[PDB]
RNA sequence: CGACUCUUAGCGGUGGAUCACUCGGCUCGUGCGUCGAUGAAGAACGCAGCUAGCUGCGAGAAUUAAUGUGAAUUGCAGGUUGAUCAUCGACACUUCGAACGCACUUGCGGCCCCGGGUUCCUCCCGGGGCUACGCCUGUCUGAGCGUCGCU
RNA sequence: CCCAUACCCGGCCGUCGCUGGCAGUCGGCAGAGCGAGAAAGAGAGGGACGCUACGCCGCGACGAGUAGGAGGGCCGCUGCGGUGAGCCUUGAAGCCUAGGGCGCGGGCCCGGGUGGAGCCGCCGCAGGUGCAGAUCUUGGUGGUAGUAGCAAAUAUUCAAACGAGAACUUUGAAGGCCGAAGUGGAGAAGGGUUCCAUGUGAACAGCAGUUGAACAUGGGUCAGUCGGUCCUGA
RNA sequence: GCCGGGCGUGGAAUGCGAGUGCCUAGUGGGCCACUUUUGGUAAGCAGAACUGGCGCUGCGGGAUGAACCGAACGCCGGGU
RNA sequence: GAAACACGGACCAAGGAGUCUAACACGUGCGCGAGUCGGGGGCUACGAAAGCCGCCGUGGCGCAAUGAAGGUGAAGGCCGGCCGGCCGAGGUGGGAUCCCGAGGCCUUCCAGUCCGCCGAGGGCGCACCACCGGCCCGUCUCGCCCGCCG
RNA sequence: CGCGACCUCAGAUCAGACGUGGCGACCCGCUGAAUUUAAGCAUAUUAGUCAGCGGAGGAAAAGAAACUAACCAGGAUUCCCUCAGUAACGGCGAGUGAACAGGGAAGAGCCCAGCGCCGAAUCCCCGCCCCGCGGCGGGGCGCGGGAAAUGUGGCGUACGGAAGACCCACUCCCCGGCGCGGGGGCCCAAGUCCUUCUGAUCGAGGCCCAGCCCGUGGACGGUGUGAGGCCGGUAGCGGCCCCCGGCGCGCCGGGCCCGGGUCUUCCCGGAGUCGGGUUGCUUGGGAAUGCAGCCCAAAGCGGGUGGUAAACUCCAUCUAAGGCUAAAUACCGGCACGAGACCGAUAGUCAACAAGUACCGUAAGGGAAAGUUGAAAAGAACUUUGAAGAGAGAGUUCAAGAGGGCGUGAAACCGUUAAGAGGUAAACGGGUGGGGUCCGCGCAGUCCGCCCGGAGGAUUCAACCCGGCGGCGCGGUCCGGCCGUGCCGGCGGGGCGGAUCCCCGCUCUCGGCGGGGGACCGCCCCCCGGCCGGCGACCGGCCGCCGCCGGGCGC
């Protein structure tokens, strides 16, 4: 809010008596703004309390290895069909979950040609979805330039561009992204994890030098390395019911003894 | 009015201070404009080197620093002396002078001076007019050769 | 998407900048399609609407297949009228229905010298499209 | 059963909340970064066929020329060798205003030159151009028992 | 003999405690158990339900509360990132409701009516986020109340005309008043078109109006001699 | 003061899981009664001690009632 | 101490009051860990985002304290003849957990092993607490000695 | 006296110029408070801030050390990070508060006076000639006028400079004319295709084999709801046409003789200023940081600084009292744009609208309220009652239950209709009862398995056969792949990493330095070989068992 707003005016109390309530008043004159209440902010005009100032801390800082951890719990959870389909996109017809297609698509040049590929790879069901997501927004947002909202479709990795980006611009949900410059905030879209991603060949054997193997550190990050587990198997229905701890029961004790 | 245990705070809030609050929206802004004038820069004198003059090779007062080493402003004048480079000349062809500099030590002198040997052996100088190649000028083949130079010339390795 | 930085997509700058156009800037936005017959005879998609052009309308509670020219074009309203295109009054009287160009396909046009090159300059970028991508 | 009074509902009034709209704001950013004695900013008064405000304009007065555009403008009338819009580089731009002949009543001048008026013979009338303060370089005319020189 | 929200028995809700129990749904690769007062081994040579484990289940005890503290809200508002192959001109939001219900509650879901173009669920994010009060702010409306009131300066009456319409206009007559220090005739200051004519009766003229200083159309101010202009005064 | 060793019928009753550290709001006007008690003729007065109340608290009773007597409260049925 | 002869309030709608910034403290969640952190600066529609840069960690805070300051600046013991070898990082009490095991855990009877379980007692003892020593800096008291370019 | 110089000083409507006023967000110079905080208050603080005054610019100001330092030293200004809430100041209370170094952004340096040399070698103006002539400039010619010796110009400025001599080295730039990417305009893809909703479709369904068509265009807006394909646009290192300067090339008229090194000989600096005293303000600056007034008032191996007053003595460091200078930086005004987790008509600017308007005040000043018919006026012809306002019909429209302050149309309040009730004001809690209102669409009341009974009807069961698929295997250990957040082996191969140890280059053939190997170590990758394990975070073929499905038979 501007910083004058609701103090142009020139106003001041009647002080007690008068019979009236002790608020800042507008100074004389012949008008209907005149002895209104002017100040404060439970008059008509005048201030709203604490006026929003633009130096509110408006931005925010994250750790850069846990940016870097982040990217790593994003792109391990496209790699699972549970989280994939949990997060609605229809998949249920891809060949293989990390999609890898050879380096010719970024010679494409023509969406004729993406669309034709999205199709061979059994993903335009994710498209033919974002279509039936187009409706308007609710609210006051389509009065501020966000009329139209709809769903995000797979995300296309690619290593280097020779055209690709201009060949899928176009299909409604795509999002290109360099494997280089890689982005939480489309890796990820609404916090949740388990966004479908289509890699290509050389993007797909550029991720060990990106953030390498444990046994590896990354070759393209000064000193990174992947975070390390909590614990190795987390598989704990099999560590449950195996021998070795079996063993180690005593009997359940599973009779109720109501009152 | 003091809570049970703290600090003893002194927040300097007394003045107007709202009313000159310094925000850094334009921050990406100016980062912006500033890349791309660096840019346009190094475009206007395409062949020359980005960072500009070499700086000499300088030491840090103040015991705490003594022990590292800088880029100075430029060459002092008795390093360009015993270089055999006339005073008038050394920016013409990018090398940074300032005639403030003494040098009470002979290392710092010489190191310096070691430094411009090396510097106007790397040069490509180019003829004053392509039709007459002239003394100093570097030979034809060369001027094929040669491109901008990026970062700072032979830059000052600790 | 659209990427010049100079050409806004605001909503209400859109509007306005609509709503205020000035004349010769309304001729263009008042522009209407051509028949099949006429768009691969002269190889134009569409035209401004000129005061003397046969017409069908395509849309709203007058479509049909009658023929009609247009009678005046209300730039200020932005809107056409159409001779036969028109509805009873209380006392009587008719009164041109206007029709919004856009809903009105072009017949047959009103070919003049300043006409002519239009449609010509409209042929001769089109065919550049064609010959700069194949 | 009345009348009156109270409660609830339907309907109708009063009133303009709510909701939905938004050619307006607010905030951030970018580029540029330009007033005036060649009369500025501001003010006044005028200007349309029918027009009060707003807007535009200046006695060439909701505009002229020029260029681009290419058939309207429109509330009602009237009337392509370029209508209308936009641009805007030519021209024009009333009275106040730093405001400038002196005053601030629009009141009194002065000078010069033209036209009626003469037949330059003084007037009178009209028209045109000048007539502010400070200051700079230069010019002209001067002042001084200032310093001198020659007769 | 009577009865408290006390005490006893029982039901239900919640909290707390047991830092209780449940991964054993161990099935023709089967064997159906750990309620048992007593440190420790049913040791080898075709079959309901369940277990959002942040879930489900079992026992006990307990429940006042201002100022204040904390927790839980599948309470509510507005916007944002995701998501619902969500809803919607075969009717969204909003509003109305003697309709049907849910929840301890905040609230919510249906039905009906009205309306005419947008809206909501869930996972996160953000806040100018919830009103009965502040002689609160702005707007609106009551009771009072068809009430107080329309009482300073003597005074009106008859007939006619116009007109839809006359206590109030106009004409005539009568009776009165101002009574020349005027309720008369003219100016300065100030007002600024109120002047004049025609027309209208919405509003205004605290009743009325055929009238008006209202409203709508038009009209109207003429100078050598009257002032300004000139002169000087404080 | 140090080592080393031996002694457990856990050495009165009753009851009960304890210890410990951070951060911390509100409050800092009180009032009443039994008993003790100071000033005062006295006061529904002024000032203390001890405990319990009221304040923060409804409920049964005292016709009525901040404080007395009984008794303290989740929502109900029966009993007393 | 309010039903008060205390004050505010005729009625309805909408608006209407613990906010933002900075600092600090403690709690909590996450990443890394004797380190940690690019916040400033560079480099490559949404995007003013994101990514990268350690020969961009300058620098911040932490890793060392103490004294006004000059300054100084964090274990020792034994053996052999002030030197040479060795042992070399306190102790006591209480301590969750772990360890040992005197023994003791059924089908016709004994002998009879492996595993599992239990346990008197005995141990190493985490964190933490109490206490006793030790070390560093300031200061005081009492002394004996050493060292060398002046 | 006269006449003429010159110096001072006047007058001009003299010839030609220039200044004034505005805006003021940012900037520079002054002036300069008090609320407030200190729980009082006077110093302090608020604050060098508001108000006041002056002056600018597209930026301003600052700026090439009379500097910082005490190092092995840095090297104009400005800005950012840090220094640092630090040193310091302070009724040492409240509070206040820098700098250097270091890292970045940017980076650029220069000119006089003086001292001297050159014959004033210099400049302005008028007249003529040529060239261009909307930035009146260039060249030439004038015994044309003036300025200037009371000092113009060239050389030259502390980094030293000059002159001479001696070697060395090129002799080519700058002015005045002519020719050979940015702003505006106009354009550029593809459905109005079939059925069906609607007042109107941009809705719904479809368009097979091309699951319509375009797509470098699926931003947005318009259009009678919701539009990639109707229109404007959007995309494009798309097209075309004007205008502006740019960039060199060539010609002409010009100014244009210029440097470096060694040697010798000469020269060299800014005064009522510094500094001192004192007074007042200011500062973190404390025996006075800065500034100013008054008094005193310099020096020249001097002067200033070296954060405690003073003397002495060494060092270090600059060179004051004259001048110019881009960039990084600031910008709530202006012009022109873009955007938003912002507000959505009591909100957001006071102002979404004939808003700084109406209106108020003598004036300075104060200062509102006020958005929405419908897709389209189709804005209700005509009949009828009335003087008319107003009605009744009719009509328009999807709708008048949208009728000109007209979307939706809440509450208070009011009218009317319906129902109920009525002497302790009303209203309320608990408990029932009665009457209404609607609803249950209650009005002959449950199905679900299995078994039995009798009536029926299929292509029908089990079991075998072929085919396909799946599960599992302790196949006691099948074969083969594949991988290892396992390891070893190496007459291995490489890439790096390492504070592990001959060649080239450089400054004083041998020593020193910098660079490049090479060796070693570590790590990783690869070629293998061998094991270990997994494939239940991850596999294939056989074999067997089992299940399912399909088709045969079976009837």
Redesign the pocket.
Same mark, same amino acid.
């Given at each position: #809010?501007?910083? /004058?707003?609701?103090?142009?005016?020139?106003?001041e109390s009647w002080?007690?008596?008068?019979? #009236?309530?002790?608020?800042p008043?507008? @100074?004389?004159?012949?008008?209907?703004?005149?002895?209104?209440?002017?100040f404060?902010? +439970?008059?008509?005009?005048? @201030?709203?309390?604490?006026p929003?100032?633009?130096?509110?801390?408006w931005?925010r @800082?994250?750790?850069?290895?846990?940016?870097?951890?982040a990217?790593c719990s994003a792109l391990?959870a496209s790699?699972?069909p549970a989280l994939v389909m949990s997060?609605?996109?229809?998949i249920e017809e891809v060949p293989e979950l990390p999609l890898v297609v050879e380096d010719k698509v970024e010679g494409y040049? %023509?969406? &004729?040609e993406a669309?034709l590929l999205l199709?061979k790879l059994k993903a335009?069901?994710?498209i033919? %979805?974002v279509?039936?997501?187009?409706?308007?927004?609710?609210?006051?947002? &389509? +009065?501020?330039?966000?009329?139209?909202?709809?769903?995000?479709?797979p995300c296309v990795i690619y290593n280097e561009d020779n055209g690709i980006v201009?060949?899928f611009?176009?299909?409604?949900g795509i999002?290109?992204?360099n494997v280089?410059?890689?982005?939480?905030?489309?890796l990820a879209?609404?916090?949740?994890v388990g @966004?479908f991603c289509i890699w290509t060949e050389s993007a797909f054997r550029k991720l060990d030098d990106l953030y390498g193997?444990?046994? %590896?550190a990354a070759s393209?990050?000064?000193?990174?390395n992947?975070?390390?587990?909590?614990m190795?198997?987390?598989?704990?229905?099999?560590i449950?019911?195996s021998p070795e701890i079996?063993?180690? /029961?005593?009997?359940?004790?599973? %009779?109720?003894?109501?009152? | 009015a003091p809570?049970?245990?703290?600090?003893?705070?002194?927040?300097?809030?007394?003045?107007?201070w709202q009313?000159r609050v310094?925000?850094?929206?334009?921050?990406?802004?100016?980062?912006?404009?500033?890349?791309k004038?660096?840019?346009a820069?190094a475009r206007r004198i395409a062949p020359r080197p980005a960072?500009?003059?070499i700086?000499?090779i300088?030491?840090?007062?103040?015991?705490?620093?003594?022990?590292?080493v800088?880029?100075?402003?430029?060459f002092?004048?008795e390093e360009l002396?015993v270089a055999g480079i006339?005073?008038?000349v050394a920016?013409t062809i990018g090398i940074?002078?300032?005639?403030?500099?003494?040098?009470?030590?002979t290392?710092?002198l010489?190191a310096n001076v070691?430094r411009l040997?090396e510097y106007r052996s790397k040069l490509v100088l180019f003829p004053?007019?392509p039709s007459?190649p002239?003394?100093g000028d570097s030979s034809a083949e060369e001027l094929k050769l040669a491109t901008q130079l990026?970062?700072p010339v032979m830059?000052?390795?600790? | 998407?659209?990427?010049?930085?100079?050409?806004?997509?605001? !909503?209400?700058?859109?509007?306005?900048?609509?709503?205020?156009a000035? $004349?010769?800037?309304?001729?263009?936005?008042?522009?209407?399609?051509?028949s *099949?017959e006429l768009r691969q005879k002269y190889n134009?998609?569409?035209?401004?609407?000129?005061?003397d052009d046969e017409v069908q309308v395509?849309?709203?509670?007058?479509?049909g297949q009658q023929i009609g020219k247009?009678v005046?074009?209300?730039?200020?309203?932005?809107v056409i009228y159409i001779e036969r295109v028109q509805?009873?009054?209380?006392?009587?009287t008719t009164?041109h229905?206007?029709?919004?160009? $856009?809903?009105?396909?072009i017949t047959r046009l *009103?070919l003049?010298?300043?006409?002519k090159?239009?449609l010509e !300059? *409209?042929a001769? $970028?089109?065919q550049?499209?064609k010959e *700069?991508?194949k």
């Open positions: #809010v501007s910083e /004058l707003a609701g103090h142009q005016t020139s106003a002080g007690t008596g008068r019979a #009236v309530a002790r608020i008043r507008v @100074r004389g004159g012949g008008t209907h703004r005149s002895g209104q209440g002017a404060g902010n +439970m008059c008509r005009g005048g @201030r709203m309390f604490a929003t100032k633009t130096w509110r801390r931005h @800082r994250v750790n850069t290895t846990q940016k870097r951890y990217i391990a790699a699972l997060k609605g996109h229809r040049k %023509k969406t &004729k669309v199709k335009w069901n994710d033919k %979805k279509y039936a997501s187009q409706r308007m927004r609710a609210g006051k947002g &389509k +009065m501020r330039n966000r009329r139209r909202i709809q769903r995000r479709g201009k060949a611009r176009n299909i409604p999002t290109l992204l280089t410059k890689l982005n939480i905030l489309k879209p609404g916090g949740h @966004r193997t444990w046994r %590896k393209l990050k000064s000193n990174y992947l975070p390390m587990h909590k190795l198997n987390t598989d704990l229905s099999r449950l019911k079996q063993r180690a /029961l005593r009997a359940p004790r599973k %009779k109720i003894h109501r009152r | 809570s049970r245990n703290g600090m003893i705070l002194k927040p300097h809030f007394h003045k107007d009313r310094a925000t850094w929206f334009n921050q990406p802004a100016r980062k912006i404009r500033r890349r004038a660096r840019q820069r960072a500009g003059p700086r000499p300088v030491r840090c007062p103040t015991v705490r620093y003594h022990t590292k800088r880029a100075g402003r430029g002092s004048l002396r006339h005073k008038k920016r940074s002078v300032d005639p403030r500099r003494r040098n009470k030590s290392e710092s010489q070691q040997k004053r007019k007459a002239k003394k990026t970062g830059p000052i390795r600790n | 998407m659209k990427f010049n930085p100079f050409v806004t997509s605001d !909503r209400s700058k859109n509007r306005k900048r609509h709503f205020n000035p $004349s010769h800037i309304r001729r263009k936005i008042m522009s209407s399609p051509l *099949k134009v998609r569409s035209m401004p609407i000129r005061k395509v849309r709203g509670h007058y479509k247009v005046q074009v209300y730039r200020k309203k932005y509805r009873e009054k209380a006392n009587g009164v229905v206007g029709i919004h160009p $856009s809903k009105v396909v *009103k003049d010298k300043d006409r090159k239009i !300059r *409209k001769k $970028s089109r550049v499209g *700069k991508g």
